Write a protein that binds this ligand. Structure first.
Ligand SMILES: CC(C)Cn1c(=O)n(C)c(=O)c2nc[nH]c21
Ligand SMILES: CC(C)Cn1c(=O)n(C)c(=O)c2nc[nH]c21
Ligand SMILES: [Mg+2]
Ligand SMILES: [Mg+2]
Ligand SMILES: [Zn+2]
Ligand SMILES: [Zn+2]
Lengths: 325, 325
């Protein structure tokens, strides 16, 4: 007949594999179904004996632990997971990685921003919040996302790892913690340098090389909005700035230092993306392309287009600003 | 947190395997989840590469195709499938039958009464309905249920058999057809005799022996209401008579022959069930017990109790009618 929303149509299930997927057309229950589909489709439910009902409860519990922030919310979560899922197909990751690595990449993508408060690590540290005190200024937000991830998995009803032997659990936990902690942008240059070093002679059988590759993969998915079609990416930037401005305003009326890139009076959407696309995004996907050449046409290309559109927007933007001076 | 109804709790999942399960407590939405669980739990999704999303669409289309009758409705459907699922565990059917047969039993059980009009074969034939004309008076209802089942399965979006080689399809289709056509009560005596004849020296290796057993199994499940706990079974009789009375009244009004067992002026819940339990139900389950002794304690016991409870109830009825004339 005419099936209900939570029942993904074959058209949707097909599109879910490409980075062109419109993440905005869906409501939470439909996104939860997409994530569910991903675990069955990638063979994770099968190879790890994940109880299908538990998988659902777990996703629902994960959803309940994401906050209603303009950016760091459940829909961003779904974006990272969906981009990771696309990466698996685009790069044929299942010929390079074991199912355990895939489970690690996917579960970490879904759990990487759990219970994000809407204010970054710099604010946590400068404001001496309880999280900064708890984690001693060492990537407090990411450490917290992990802890929540495993407190959730500790609940028997949500433990998608119930049937994995203990050695496997430990191996998965270690991998997830490493990936989630790697998303902290403060460590971006460090992680990039290490990867590029290993990239001089990449060894798919070297465990230390794969760890760095997985860290890069989840980092790519975490800040991959600009790779998506313009109509899908555009709104995310506004959501991010809304969050950044909120923090800068708070930092100003609290006497805490304010980062220029979050300063309402110094940053423009255009100048912001241009620099981020040319000095963070493109260089990263550029090195990843050396390993997976198909990545250039599917992701480096839309980044070049995005860079050019924002450079045009910057002209008009600066013009408008002159009239207001 | 607190999970929605469509996410079965582990308590429900555990009770779903026994004939004591209370079929009246759930709404279609919930029952559909149960059926879905059954396919994953029996390993049918796994062994036949059923796309889990397709499984959901298929179950939804099946639900939409059951009519809103007092008895032959989606809930009866669920009862039959749930009783079949209970028997797979109780009798350890997975030790005697291949996965292909289990799939045949479960799917036939879910589809056996699809699009039931609410008036039995005798009515279709006597009123010379389109169905009776289409099927040449040969089990018109059963032929129609089966045709609708494969109509649904022919819709790509609902084709839970999409990943089975054609030789497998043919084997599954033929089995379902045999089973669904076997549910026509007009053939009860015939089927029972053949089964008993083979029962003289049952051979789990003889395919003709196994075909009869599967026929008896689905026949048992189809009319297994009285096997359920008194409070779960009682309301079903009212639904049945409500349908029978609707037909006899109509037959009376159109001047068509009326069957005594459906006549308001002659049937009482007690008279209806006593004979049915004593001469149809008990004998059939007695034969099945010769192969699965555990059936006696789990199913004959409650049938005996229902027989006695209804017989005693009739005495109270006769004594009451006496006290009035
Ligand atoms: C400032 C930077 C570390 C954070 N950051 C980010 O995460 N995304 C996704 C952007 O699009 C972006 N644009 C500027 N900065 C950005
Ligand atoms: C005995 C038969 C002719 C009529 N019949 C029947 O078909 N089913 C399924 C019943 O449950 C039933 N109960 C009484 N009569 C019944
Ligand atoms: Mg983050
Ligand atoms: Mg029937
Ligand atoms: Zn993130
Ligand atoms: Zn029936």
């Amino acid at each position: 007949p005419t099936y209900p929303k939570y029942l993904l149509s074959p058209e949707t299930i097909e599109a879910l594999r490409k980075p062109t997927f419109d993440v905005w057309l869906w409501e939470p229950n439909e996104m939860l179904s997409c994530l569910e589909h991903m675990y069955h489709d990638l063979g994770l439910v099968r190879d790890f004996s994940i109880n299908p009902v538990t998988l659902r409860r777990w996703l629902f519990c994960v959803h309940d632990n994401y906050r209603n922030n303009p950016f760091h919310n459940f829909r961003h979560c779904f974006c990272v997971a969906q981009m990771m899922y696309s990466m698996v197909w685009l790069c044929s990751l299942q010929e390079k990685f074991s199912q355990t690595d895939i489970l690690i990449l996917m579960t970490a993508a879904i759990c990487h921003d759990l219970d994000h408060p809407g204010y970054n690590n710099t604010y946590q540290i400068n404001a001496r919040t309880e999280l900064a005190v708890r984690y001693n200024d060492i990537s407090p937000l990411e450490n917290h996302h992990c802890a929540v991830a495993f407190q959730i998995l500790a609940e028997p009803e949500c433990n998608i790892f119930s049937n994995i032997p203990p050695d496997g659990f430990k191996q998965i936990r270690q991998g997830m913690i490493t990936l989630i902690l790697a998303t902290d942008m403060a460590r971006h240059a460090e992680i990039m340098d290490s990867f590029k070093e290993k990239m001089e002679n990449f060894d798919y059988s070297n465990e230390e090389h794969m760890t760095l590759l997985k860290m890069i993969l989840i980092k790519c998915c975490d800040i991959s909005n600009e790779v998506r079609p313009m109509e899908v990416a555009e709104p995310w930037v506004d959501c991010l700035l809304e969050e950044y401005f909120m923090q800068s305003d708070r930092e100003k009326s609290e006497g805490l230092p304010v980062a220029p890139f979050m300063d309402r009076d110094k940053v423009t959407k255009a100048t912001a993306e241009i620099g981020f696309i040319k000095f963070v995004l493109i260089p990263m996907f550029e090195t990843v392309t050396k390993l997976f050449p198909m990545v250039e046409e599917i992701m480096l290309q839309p980044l070049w287009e995005s860079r050019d559109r924002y450079e045009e927007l910057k002209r008009i933007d600066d013009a408008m600003k002159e009239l207001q001076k």
